[PDB]
mmCIF file of N, CA, C and O in Angstrom:
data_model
loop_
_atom_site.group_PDB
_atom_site.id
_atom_site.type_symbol
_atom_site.label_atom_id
_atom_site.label_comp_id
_atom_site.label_asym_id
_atom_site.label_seq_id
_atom_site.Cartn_x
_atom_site.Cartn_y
_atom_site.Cartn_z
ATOM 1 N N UNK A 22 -4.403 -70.368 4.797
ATOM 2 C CA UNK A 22 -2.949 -70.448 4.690
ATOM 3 C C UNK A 22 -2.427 -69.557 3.570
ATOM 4 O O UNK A 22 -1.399 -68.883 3.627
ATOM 5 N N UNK A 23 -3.115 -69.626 2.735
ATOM 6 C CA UNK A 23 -2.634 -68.781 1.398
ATOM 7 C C UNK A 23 -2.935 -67.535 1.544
ATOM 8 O O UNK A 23 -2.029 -66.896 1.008
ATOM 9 N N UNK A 24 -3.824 -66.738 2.039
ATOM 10 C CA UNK A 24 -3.535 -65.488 2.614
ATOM 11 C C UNK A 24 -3.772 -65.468 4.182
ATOM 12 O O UNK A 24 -4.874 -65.184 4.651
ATOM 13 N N UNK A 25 -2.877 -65.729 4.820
ATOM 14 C CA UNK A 25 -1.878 -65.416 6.100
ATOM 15 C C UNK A 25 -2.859 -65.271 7.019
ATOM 16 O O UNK A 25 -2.781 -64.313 7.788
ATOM 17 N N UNK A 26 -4.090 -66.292 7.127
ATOM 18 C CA UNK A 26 -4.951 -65.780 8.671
ATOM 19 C C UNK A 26 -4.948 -66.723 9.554
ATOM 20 O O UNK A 26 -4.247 -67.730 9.652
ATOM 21 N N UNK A 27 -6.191 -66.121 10.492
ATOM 22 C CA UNK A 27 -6.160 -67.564 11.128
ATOM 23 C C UNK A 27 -6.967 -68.495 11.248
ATOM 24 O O UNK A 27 -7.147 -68.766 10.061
ATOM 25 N N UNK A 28 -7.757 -69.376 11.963
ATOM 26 C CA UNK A 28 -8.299 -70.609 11.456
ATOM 27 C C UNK A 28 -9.550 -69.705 11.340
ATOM 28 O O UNK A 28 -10.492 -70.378 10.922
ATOM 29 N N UNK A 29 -9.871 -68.484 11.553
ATOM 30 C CA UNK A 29 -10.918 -67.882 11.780
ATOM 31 C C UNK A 29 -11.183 -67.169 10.698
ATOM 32 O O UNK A 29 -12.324 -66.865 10.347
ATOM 33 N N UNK A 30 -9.649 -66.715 9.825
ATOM 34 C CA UNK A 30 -10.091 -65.962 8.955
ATOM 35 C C UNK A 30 -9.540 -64.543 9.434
ATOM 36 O O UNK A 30 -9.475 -63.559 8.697
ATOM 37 N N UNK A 31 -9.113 -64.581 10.909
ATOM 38 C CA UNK A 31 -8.463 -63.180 11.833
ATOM 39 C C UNK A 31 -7.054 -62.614 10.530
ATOM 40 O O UNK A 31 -6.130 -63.386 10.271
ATOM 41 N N UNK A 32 -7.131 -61.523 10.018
ATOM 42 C CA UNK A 32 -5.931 -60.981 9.409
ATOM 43 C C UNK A 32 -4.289 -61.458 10.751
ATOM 44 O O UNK A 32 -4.057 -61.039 11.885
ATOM 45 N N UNK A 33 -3.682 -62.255 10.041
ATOM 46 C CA UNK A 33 -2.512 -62.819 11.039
ATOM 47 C C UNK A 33 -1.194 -61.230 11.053
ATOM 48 O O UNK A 33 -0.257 -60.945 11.799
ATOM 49 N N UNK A 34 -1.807 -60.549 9.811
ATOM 50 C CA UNK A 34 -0.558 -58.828 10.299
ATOM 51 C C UNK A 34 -2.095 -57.780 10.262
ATOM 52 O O UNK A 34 -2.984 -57.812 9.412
ATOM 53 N N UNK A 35 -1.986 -56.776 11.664
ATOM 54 C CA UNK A 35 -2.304 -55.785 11.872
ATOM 55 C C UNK A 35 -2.428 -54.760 10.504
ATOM 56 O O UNK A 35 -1.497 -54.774 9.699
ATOM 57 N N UNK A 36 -3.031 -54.305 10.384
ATOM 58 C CA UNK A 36 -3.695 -53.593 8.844
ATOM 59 C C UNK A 36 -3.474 -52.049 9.079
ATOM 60 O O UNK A 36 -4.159 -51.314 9.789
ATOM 61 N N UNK A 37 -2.298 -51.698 8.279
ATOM 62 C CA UNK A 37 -1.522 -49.731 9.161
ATOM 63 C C UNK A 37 -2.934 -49.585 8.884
ATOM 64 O O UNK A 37 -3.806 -50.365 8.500
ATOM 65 N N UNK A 38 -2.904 -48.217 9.224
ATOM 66 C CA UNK A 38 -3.744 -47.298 10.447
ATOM 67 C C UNK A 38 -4.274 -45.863 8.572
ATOM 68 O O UNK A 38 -5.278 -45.279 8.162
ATOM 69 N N UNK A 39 -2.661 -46.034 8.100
ATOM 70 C CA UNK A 39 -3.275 -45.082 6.926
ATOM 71 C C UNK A 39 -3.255 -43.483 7.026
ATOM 72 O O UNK A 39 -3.469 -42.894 5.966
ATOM 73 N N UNK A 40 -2.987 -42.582 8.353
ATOM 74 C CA UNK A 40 -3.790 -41.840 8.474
ATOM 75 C C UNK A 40 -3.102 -40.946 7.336
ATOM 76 O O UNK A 40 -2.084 -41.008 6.648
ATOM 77 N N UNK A 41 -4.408 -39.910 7.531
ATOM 78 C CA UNK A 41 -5.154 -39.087 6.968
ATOM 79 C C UNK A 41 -4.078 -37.735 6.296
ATOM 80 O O UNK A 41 -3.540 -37.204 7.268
ATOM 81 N N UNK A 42 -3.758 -37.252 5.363
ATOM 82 C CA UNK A 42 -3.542 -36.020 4.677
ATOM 83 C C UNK A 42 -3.709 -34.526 5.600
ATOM 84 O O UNK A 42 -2.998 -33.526 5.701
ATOM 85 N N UNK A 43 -5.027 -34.940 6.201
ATOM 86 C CA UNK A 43 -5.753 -33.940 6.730
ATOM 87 C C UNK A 43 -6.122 -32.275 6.002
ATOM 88 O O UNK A 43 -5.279 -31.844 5.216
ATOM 89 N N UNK A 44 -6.961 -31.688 6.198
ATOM 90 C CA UNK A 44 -7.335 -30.464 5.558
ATOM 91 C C UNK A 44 -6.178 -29.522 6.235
ATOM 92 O O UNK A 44 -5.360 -29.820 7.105
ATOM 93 N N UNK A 45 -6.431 -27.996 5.384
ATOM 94 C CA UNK A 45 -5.397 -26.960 5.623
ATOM 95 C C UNK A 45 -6.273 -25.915 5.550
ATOM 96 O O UNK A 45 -7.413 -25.918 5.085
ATOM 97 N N UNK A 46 -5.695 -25.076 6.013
ATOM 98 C CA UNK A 46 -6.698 -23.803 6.387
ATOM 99 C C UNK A 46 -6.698 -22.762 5.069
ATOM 100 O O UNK A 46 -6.119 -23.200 4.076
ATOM 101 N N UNK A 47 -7.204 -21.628 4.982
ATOM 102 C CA UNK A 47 -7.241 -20.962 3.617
ATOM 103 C C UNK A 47 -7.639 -19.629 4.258
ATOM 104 O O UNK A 47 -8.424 -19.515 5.199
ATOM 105 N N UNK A 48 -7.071 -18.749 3.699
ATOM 106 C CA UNK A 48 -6.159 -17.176 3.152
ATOM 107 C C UNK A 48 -7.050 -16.417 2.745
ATOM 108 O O UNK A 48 -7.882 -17.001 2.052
ATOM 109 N N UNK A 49 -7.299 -14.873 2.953
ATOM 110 C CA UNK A 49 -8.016 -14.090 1.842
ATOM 111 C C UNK A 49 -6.986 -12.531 2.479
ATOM 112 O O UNK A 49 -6.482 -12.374 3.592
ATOM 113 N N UNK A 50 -6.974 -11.761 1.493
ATOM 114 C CA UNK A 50 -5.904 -10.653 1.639
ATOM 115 C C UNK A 50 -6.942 -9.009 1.155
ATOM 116 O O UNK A 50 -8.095 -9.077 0.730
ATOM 117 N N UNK A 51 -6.430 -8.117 1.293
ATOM 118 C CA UNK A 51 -6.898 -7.104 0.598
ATOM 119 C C UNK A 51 -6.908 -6.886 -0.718
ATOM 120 O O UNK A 51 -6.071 -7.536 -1.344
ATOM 121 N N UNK A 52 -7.867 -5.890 -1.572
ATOM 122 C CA UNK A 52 -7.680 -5.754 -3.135
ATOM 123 C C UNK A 52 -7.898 -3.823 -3.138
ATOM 124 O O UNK A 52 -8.824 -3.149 -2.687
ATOM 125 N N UNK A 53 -7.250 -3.611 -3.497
ATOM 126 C CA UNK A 53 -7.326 -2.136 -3.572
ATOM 127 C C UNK A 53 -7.150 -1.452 -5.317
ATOM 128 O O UNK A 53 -6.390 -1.919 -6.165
ATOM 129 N N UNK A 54 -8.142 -0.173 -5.515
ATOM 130 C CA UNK A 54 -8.248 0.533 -6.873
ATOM 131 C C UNK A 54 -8.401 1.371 -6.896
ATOM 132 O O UNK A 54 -9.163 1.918 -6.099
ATOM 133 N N UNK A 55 -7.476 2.268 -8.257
ATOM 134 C CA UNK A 55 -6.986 3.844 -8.161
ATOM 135 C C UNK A 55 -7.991 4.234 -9.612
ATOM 136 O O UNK A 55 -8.307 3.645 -10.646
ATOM 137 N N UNK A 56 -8.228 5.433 -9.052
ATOM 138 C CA UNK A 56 -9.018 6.373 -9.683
ATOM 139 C C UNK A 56 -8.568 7.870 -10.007
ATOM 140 O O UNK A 56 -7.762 8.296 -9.179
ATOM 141 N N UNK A 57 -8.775 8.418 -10.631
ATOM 142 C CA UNK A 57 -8.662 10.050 -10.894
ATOM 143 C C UNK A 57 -9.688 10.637 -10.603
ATOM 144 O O UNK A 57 -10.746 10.125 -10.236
ATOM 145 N N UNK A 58 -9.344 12.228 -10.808
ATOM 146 C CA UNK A 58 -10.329 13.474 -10.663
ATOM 147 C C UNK A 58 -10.905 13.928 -12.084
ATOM 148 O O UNK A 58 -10.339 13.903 -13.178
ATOM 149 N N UNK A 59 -12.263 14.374 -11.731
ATOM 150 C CA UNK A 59 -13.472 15.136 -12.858
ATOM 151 C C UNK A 59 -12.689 16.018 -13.153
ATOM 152 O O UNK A 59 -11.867 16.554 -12.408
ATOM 153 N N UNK A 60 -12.961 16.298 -14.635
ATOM 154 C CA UNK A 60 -12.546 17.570 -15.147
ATOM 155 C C UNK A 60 -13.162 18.871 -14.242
ATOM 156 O O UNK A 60 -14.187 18.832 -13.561
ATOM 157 N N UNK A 61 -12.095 20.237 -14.455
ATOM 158 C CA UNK A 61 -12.770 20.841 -13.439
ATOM 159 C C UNK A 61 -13.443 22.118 -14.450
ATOM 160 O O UNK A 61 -12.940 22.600 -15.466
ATOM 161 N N UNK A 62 -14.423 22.381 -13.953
ATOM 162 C CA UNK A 62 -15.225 23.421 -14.653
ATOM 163 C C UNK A 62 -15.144 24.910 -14.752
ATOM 164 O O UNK A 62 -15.160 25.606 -13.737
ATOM 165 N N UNK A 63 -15.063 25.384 -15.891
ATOM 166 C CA UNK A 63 -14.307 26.446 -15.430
ATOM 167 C C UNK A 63 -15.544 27.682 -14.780
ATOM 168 O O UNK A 63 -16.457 28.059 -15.514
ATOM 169 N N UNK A 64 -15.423 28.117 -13.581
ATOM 170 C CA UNK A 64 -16.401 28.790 -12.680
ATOM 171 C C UNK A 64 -17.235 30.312 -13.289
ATOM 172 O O UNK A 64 -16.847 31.447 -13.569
ATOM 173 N N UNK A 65 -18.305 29.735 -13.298
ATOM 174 C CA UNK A 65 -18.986 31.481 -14.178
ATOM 175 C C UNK A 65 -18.560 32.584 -12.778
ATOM 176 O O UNK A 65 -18.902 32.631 -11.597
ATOM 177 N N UNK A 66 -17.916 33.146 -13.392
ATOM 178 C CA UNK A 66 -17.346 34.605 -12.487
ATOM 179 C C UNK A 66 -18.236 35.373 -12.232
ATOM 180 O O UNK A 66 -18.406 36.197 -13.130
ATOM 181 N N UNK A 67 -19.271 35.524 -10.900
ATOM 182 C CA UNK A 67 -20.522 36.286 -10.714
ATOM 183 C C UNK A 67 -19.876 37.834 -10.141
ATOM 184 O O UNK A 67 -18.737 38.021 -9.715
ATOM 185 N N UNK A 68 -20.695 38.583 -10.245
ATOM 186 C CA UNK A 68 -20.215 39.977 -9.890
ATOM 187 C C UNK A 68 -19.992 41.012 -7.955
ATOM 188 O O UNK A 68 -19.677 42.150 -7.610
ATOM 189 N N UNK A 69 -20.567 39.163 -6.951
ATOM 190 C CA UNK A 69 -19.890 39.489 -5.317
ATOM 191 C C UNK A 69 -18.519 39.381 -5.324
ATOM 192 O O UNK A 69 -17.695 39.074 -6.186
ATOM 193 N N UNK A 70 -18.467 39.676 -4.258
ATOM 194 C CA UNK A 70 -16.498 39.419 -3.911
ATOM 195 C C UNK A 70 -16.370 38.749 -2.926
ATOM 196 O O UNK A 70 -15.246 38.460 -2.518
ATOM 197 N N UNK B 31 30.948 -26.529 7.219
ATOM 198 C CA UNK B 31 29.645 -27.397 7.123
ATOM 199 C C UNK B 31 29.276 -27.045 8.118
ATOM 200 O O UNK B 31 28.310 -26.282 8.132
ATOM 201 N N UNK B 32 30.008 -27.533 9.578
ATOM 202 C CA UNK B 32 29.211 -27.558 11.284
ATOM 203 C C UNK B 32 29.110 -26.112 11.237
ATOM 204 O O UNK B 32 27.972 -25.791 11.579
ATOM 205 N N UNK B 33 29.689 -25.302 11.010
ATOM 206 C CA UNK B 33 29.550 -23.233 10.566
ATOM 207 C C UNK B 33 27.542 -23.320 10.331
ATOM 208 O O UNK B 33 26.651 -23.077 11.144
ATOM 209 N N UNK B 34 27.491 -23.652 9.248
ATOM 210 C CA UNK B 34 26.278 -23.517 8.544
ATOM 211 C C UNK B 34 25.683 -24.171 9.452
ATOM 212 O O UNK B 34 25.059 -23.432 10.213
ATOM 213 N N UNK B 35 25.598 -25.565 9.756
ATOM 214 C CA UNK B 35 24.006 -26.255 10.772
ATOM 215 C C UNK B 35 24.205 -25.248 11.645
ATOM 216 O O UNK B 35 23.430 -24.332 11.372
ATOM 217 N N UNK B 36 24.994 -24.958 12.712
ATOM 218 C CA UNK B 36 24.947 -24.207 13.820
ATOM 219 C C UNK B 36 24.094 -22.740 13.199
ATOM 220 O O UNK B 36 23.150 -22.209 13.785
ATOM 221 N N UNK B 37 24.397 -22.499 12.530
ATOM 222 C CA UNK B 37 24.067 -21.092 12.151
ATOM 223 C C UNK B 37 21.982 -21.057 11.665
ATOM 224 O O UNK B 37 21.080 -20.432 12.222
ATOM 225 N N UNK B 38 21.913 -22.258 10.136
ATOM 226 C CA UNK B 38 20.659 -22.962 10.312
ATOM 227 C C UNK B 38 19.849 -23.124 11.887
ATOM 228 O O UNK B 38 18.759 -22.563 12.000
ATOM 229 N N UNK B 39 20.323 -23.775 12.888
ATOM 230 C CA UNK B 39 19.844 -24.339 14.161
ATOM 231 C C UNK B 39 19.079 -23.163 14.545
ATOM 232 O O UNK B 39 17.855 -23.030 14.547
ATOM 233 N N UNK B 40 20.134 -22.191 14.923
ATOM 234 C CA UNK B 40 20.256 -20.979 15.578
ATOM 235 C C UNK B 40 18.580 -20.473 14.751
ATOM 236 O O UNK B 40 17.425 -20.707 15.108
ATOM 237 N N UNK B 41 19.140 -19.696 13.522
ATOM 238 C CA UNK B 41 17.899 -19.149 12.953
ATOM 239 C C UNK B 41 16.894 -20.102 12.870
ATOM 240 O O UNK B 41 15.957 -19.363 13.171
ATOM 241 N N UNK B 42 16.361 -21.233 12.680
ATOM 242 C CA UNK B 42 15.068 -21.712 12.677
ATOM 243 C C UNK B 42 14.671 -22.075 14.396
ATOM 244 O O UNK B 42 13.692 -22.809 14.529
ATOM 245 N N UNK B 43 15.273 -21.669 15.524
ATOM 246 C CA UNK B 43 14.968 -22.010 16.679
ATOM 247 C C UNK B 43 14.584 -20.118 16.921
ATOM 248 O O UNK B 43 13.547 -19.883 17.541
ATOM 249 N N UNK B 44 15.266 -19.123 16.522
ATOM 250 C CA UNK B 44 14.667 -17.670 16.766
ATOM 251 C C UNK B 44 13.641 -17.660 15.904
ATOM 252 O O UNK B 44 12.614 -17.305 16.481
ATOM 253 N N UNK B 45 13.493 -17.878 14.859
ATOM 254 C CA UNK B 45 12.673 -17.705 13.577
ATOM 255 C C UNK B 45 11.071 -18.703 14.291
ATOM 256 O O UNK B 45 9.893 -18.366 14.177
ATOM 257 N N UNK B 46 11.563 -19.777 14.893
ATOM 258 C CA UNK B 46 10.046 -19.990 14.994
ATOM 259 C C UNK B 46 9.487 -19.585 16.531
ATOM 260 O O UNK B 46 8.324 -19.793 16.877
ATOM 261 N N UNK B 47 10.554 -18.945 17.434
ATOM 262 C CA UNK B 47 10.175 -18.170 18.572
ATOM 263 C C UNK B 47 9.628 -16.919 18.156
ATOM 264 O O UNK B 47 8.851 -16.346 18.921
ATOM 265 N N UNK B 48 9.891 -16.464 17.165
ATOM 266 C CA UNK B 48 9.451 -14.878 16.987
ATOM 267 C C UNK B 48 7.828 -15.040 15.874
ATOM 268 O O UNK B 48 7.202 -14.106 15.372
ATOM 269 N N UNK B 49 7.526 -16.520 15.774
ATOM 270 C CA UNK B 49 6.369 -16.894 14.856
ATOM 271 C C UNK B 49 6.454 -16.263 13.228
ATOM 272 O O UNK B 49 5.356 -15.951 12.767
ATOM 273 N N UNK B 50 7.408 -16.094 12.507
ATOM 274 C CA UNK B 50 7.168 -15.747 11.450
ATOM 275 C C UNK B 50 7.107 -16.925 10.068
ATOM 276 O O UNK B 50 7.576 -18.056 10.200
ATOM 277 N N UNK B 51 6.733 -16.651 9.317
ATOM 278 C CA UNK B 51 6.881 -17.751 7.968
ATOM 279 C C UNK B 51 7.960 -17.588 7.028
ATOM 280 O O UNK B 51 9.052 -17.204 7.448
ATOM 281 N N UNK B 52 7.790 -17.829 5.841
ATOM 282 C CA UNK B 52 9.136 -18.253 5.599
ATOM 283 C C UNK B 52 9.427 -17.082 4.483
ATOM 284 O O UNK B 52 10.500 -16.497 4.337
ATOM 285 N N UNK B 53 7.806 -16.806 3.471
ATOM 286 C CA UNK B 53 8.147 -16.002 2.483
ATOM 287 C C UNK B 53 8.103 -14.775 2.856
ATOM 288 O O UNK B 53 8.579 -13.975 2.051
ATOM 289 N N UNK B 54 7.647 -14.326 3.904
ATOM 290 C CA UNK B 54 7.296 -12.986 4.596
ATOM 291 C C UNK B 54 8.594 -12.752 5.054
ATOM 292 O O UNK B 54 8.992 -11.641 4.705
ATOM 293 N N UNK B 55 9.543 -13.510 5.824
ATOM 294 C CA UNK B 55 10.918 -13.197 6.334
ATOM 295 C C UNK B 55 11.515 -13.289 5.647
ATOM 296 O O UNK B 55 12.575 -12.787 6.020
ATOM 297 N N UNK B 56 11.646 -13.903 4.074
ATOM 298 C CA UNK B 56 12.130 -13.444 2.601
ATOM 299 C C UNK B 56 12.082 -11.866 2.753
ATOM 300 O O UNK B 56 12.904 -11.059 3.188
ATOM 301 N N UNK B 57 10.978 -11.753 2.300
ATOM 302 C CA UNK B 57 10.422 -10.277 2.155
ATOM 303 C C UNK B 57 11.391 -9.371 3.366
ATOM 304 O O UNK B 57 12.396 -8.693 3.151
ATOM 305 N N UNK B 58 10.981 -9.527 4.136
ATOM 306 C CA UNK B 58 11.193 -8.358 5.232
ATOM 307 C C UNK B 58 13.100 -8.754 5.597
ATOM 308 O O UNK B 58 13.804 -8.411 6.547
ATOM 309 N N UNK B 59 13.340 -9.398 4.655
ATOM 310 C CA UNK B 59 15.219 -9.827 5.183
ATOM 311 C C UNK B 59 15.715 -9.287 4.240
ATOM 312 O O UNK B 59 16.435 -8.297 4.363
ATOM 313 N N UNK B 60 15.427 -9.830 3.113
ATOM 314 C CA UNK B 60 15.830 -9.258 1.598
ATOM 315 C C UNK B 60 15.572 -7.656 1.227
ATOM 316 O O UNK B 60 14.477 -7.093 1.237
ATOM 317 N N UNK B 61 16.910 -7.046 0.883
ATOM 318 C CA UNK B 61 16.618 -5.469 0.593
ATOM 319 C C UNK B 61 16.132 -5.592 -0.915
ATOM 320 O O UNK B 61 16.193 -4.575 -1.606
ATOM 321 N N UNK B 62 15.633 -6.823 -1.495
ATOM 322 C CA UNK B 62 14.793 -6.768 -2.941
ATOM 323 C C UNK B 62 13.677 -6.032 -3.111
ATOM 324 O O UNK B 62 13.088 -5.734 -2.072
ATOM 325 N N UNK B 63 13.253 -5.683 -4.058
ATOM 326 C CA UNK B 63 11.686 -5.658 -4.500
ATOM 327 C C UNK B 63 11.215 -6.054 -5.237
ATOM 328 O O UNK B 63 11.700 -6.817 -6.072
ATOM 329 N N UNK B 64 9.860 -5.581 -5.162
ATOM 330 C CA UNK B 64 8.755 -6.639 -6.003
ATOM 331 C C UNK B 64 8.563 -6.520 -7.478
ATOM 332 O O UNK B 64 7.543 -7.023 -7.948
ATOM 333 N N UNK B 65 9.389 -5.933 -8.253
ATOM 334 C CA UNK B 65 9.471 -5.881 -9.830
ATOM 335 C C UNK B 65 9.054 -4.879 -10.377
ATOM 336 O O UNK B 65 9.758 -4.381 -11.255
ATOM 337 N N UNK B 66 7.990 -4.368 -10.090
ATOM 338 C CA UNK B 66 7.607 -3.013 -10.275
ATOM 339 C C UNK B 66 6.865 -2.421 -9.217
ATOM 340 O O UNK B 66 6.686 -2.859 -8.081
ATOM 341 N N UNK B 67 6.322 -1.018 -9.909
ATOM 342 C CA UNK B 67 5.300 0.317 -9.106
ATOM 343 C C UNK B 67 4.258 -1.153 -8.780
ATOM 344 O O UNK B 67 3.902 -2.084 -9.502
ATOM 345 N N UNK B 68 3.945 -0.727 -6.990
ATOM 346 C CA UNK B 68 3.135 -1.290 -6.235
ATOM 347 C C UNK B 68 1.899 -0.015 -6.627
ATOM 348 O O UNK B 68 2.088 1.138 -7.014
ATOM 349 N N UNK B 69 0.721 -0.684 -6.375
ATOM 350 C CA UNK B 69 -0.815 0.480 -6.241
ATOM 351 C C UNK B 69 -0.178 0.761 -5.127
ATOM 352 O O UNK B 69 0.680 1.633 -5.261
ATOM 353 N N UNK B 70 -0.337 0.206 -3.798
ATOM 354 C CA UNK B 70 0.284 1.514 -2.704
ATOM 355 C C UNK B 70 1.723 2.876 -3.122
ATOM 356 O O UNK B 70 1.853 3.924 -2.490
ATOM 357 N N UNK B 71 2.569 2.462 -4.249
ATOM 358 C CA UNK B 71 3.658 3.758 -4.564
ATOM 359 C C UNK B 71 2.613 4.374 -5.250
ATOM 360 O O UNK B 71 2.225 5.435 -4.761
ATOM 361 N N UNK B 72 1.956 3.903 -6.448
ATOM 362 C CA UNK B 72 0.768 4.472 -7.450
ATOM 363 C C UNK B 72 0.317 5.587 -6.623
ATOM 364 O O UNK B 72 0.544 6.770 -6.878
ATOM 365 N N UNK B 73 -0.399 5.102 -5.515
ATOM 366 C CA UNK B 73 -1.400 6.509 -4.522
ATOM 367 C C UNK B 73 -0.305 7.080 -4.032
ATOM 368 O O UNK B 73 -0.351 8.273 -4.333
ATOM 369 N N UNK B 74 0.467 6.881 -3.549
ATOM 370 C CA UNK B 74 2.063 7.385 -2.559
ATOM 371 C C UNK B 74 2.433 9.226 -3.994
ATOM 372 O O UNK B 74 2.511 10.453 -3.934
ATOM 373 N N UNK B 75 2.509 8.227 -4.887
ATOM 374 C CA UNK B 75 2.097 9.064 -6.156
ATOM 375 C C UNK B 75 1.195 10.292 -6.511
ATOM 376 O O UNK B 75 1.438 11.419 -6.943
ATOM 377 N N UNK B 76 0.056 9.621 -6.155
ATOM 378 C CA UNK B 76 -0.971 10.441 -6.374
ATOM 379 C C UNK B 76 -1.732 11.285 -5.544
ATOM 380 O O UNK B 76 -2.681 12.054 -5.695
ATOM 381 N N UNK B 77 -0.794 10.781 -4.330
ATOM 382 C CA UNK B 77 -1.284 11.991 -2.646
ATOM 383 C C UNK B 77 -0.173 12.744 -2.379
ATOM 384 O O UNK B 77 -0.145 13.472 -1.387
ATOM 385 N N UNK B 78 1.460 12.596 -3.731
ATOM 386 C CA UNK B 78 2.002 13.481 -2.962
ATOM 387 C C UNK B 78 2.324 14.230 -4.218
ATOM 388 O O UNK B 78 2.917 15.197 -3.738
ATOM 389 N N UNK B 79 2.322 14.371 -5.208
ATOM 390 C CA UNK B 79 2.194 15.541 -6.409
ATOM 391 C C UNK B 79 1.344 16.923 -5.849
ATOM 392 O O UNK B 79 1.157 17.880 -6.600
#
């Protein structure tokens, strides 16, 4: 009597259900990086043309 | 007020026929930008000097 069952002990209110949060899906994107040019050398000048 | 829901209705009934999200159609609605030089202007930069 004092908590609400029945002679059995049966919960006398239905017990919610609760549901779930559930999971979420997940993301990944591009990463991109800048660089420069070598110094340039200055060319030994050979004597073809 | 009824101006605005009608107008709301309208765009979130095209908006989720055409599948887009919410911050991306920010992006692509808004003539803003992103605060500064993107690495893609950086190379845009550095492939057209």
């Amino acid at each position: 009597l004092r908590h609400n069952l029945s002679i059995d002990g049966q919960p006398l209110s239905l017990a919610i259900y609760a549901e779930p949060t559930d999971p979420k899906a997940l993301l990944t994107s591009m990463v991109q990086a800048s660089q420069g040019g070598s110094a340039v050398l200055p060319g030994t000048l050979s004597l073809y043309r | 007020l009824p101006r605005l829901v009608i107008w709301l209705y309208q765009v979130t009934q095209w908006l989720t026929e055409a599948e887009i999200t919410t911050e991306a159609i920010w992006l692509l609605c808004t003539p803003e930008f992103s605060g500064n030089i993107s690495p893609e202007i950086s190379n845009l930069l550095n492939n057209l000097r």
